[model samples]
Target: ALAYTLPQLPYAYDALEPHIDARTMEIHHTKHHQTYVDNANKALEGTEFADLPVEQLIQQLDRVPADKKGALRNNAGGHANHSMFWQIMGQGQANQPSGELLDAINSAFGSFDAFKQKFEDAAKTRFGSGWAWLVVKDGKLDVVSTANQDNPLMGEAIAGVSGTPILGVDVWEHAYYLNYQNRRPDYLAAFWNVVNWDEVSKRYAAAK
Candidate 1:
């Protein structure tokens, strides 16, 4: 299979405006995310892992050479994570989930409000850099956090967590510093306004 390439955003840079600034979207996609795609493809050159899927490659990081492991893990995870991040967020999505997804969230965390609190805590408590994820683990919805570019799909050995992430929020400073400045909580709060629950619900069904 061909190496990874940066996927175009499904909406305009300003489409998610007010919640996510236009400047942030442009820079995050064109500069930050593009760098990860370029570096990851570069690191895959002449390697057997070139043929592996990004998800599979991340889960089996041990197979990667030690010297190249850092690049592959960070850049590849960044590329894959950001790709999913953009797809699961947009301007006009509902402010909350419904149907089976709402049922699952209610069952998992007792109520929709509770789940939001837990998820916000995970996103806020992640310290320096990381992501907050809503994942299906052992057939149950769960909230988890991973540092830097690490993701739940990388398995416990490398990622220190394992699950199928359906929805994730980038807590990294670069994801919000442009607009929120020192207020990560402001960014996290704004995230809810643009969440694409339809996409998240589809992922939830597939994960099940």
Candidate 2:
């Protein structure tokens, strides 16, 4: 049975248009995201992982049997990552973060512009398919990159990153190939315009 579902994007596919076109949004959600949801169910059905939330499943990868660990990691990670991906973005309301989230950014990376530079570097410099993240590590906000569907929640042991992710971006070509093509930089730049800082702040607060 399917324990994880593809979360409906909080806004219309065209909600973040210009920054993120409607076509790409629809396909990414319906295709890529849906596949992950379906695959994770297959990997976990009738297993110890079944019924565990996607977040908890990824975070507890060590308990998974050796042979099935890879499948669970990739699929569960994809499920959790895309779930957050949808929530943390929508109309870019408030444009940028405020209050504690803003305070944490300035404290961690010295102003929002600097933070964007670091985040973009992580997203762009990742040579292959991966994700860029803003996470609370060791009680502090930090930036990191994880290959493929890997994420900070998998911990330093598996993904070489450990933190409570407050924000992230999918740098997988499928994330931008249809629209921006080879210009990942342009896609990264436009991504900021669609971020829902409100959701990020809530995560940040909870992670603390």
Candidate 3:
């Protein structure tokens, strides 16, 4: 079936409490992420791409049979990216970047304050639904935004990828609307409070 099913949260729905409420987590993961998986897999069923690995399907998107290209790109990318997002978060325990990551950030943006400004700016400026990321290129960190589920690692308008991803802030309305209304900056600020810097550091390590 080439299925891309929804995975359970790493913690309780309210695990991200005070930062991410239970209802929002439930709806975001179950209703939203699930729909993408279901639709993408359904679109691939019995097609020539059915037995192909998702990485292959994505890398050769231009060949995804014109009939189902849109579905495959939107849903498959959504499923893969969201899964990584969930895996890189936690309910309890926390920490911050140190050692190499700290040094990299210092060199890349002059200071943590600068990196925060750049990241927040990218997230806030995205015209519609999308994400803003802290990606590494040529062993230096940079801030970039992707219009959809597109990650900087992908080759395209997507920026060059190399170093490591220290952090990623999702700007999708589904990520903040329930609590912040249309005030995205308010949500962006709160996002830092709940950020699992510990998990982020781990992601940084693995990426580098």
Candidate 4:
């Protein structure tokens, strides 16, 4: 009977307003993310990894029981992705970066504008539901995309690139449909308005 519960959001439902609506935040957290938490824990029942960290389960997904593999990958990945998503976004924060992170971005992508183009391309070009990530691998920055609820931390075997995600954007339809509808680029643009760069910087520092 291993169990998992939804982590409380660090901000109020309306905290991301005008950028991400309150109604969408409420449902995304209480319903969508919660379902993933519940199902992931349920799928871990009686397994050796039941009491292990969620990160461990995901990073070792190839070793998960055959019968439980799909459930664990989807639900566990969903939980991890949404958790990081909420942290890297907020109602107010300097959307721009300064310090080592800025240096890294410049070194890796030439300029912040160039980095934006690459990141946005990864996000916008994802055919369907997915995520765009800025990650640190081998002490360098890189941009990559993961389909569905997958993320960079799941290792290259599963997520196609192994790295520490410092920032991520969820392009899943449910994340933006209420506000932007089919114009995903608009939603992606609005994302810049709320990005919690401070948190992203910290993640980058720790990862590096």
- On TM-score, the leading prediction is 2
In order, what is each prediction's RMSD in angstroms?
A: 1.3, 1.1, 2.7, 1.3
TM-score versus the correct structure, for each prediction: 0.96, 0.97, 0.86, 0.96
List model 2 lDDT by residue over 1-208, tens digit each: 5788888788999999899889999999999999999998888876877978888889888998887799988999999999999999988462688898899899999999999999999999999999999999888999999999998999999998889899999999989988899999999999999898889999999999
**Model 3 agreement with the true structure over 73-145: per-residue lDDT tens digits:** 7887677667767766666542346777778789989877777889899999987888788876665678888
**Residue 16, candidate 3: alpha-carbon lDDT:** 82
Full-model lDDT, candidate 4: 0.89
Model 4 misplaced regions, further than 4 Å: none
Better of 2 and 3 by lDDT: 2
Instruction: Please give, for residues 50-135, the per-residue lDDT of candidate 1 as tens digits.
Output: 87778788877788888889998899999889999999998876389999999999999998889999999999999888999999
Model 1, global lDDT: 0.91
Between candidates 1 and 3, name the one with more favorable TM-score: 1
Candidate 1 vs 2: which has more TM-score: 2
Estimate every model's Cα lDDT from 0 to 1: 0.91, 0.91, 0.73, 0.89
TM-score of 2: 0.97
lDDT of 4 at 140: 96
Candidate 2 lDDT score relative to the true structure: 0.91
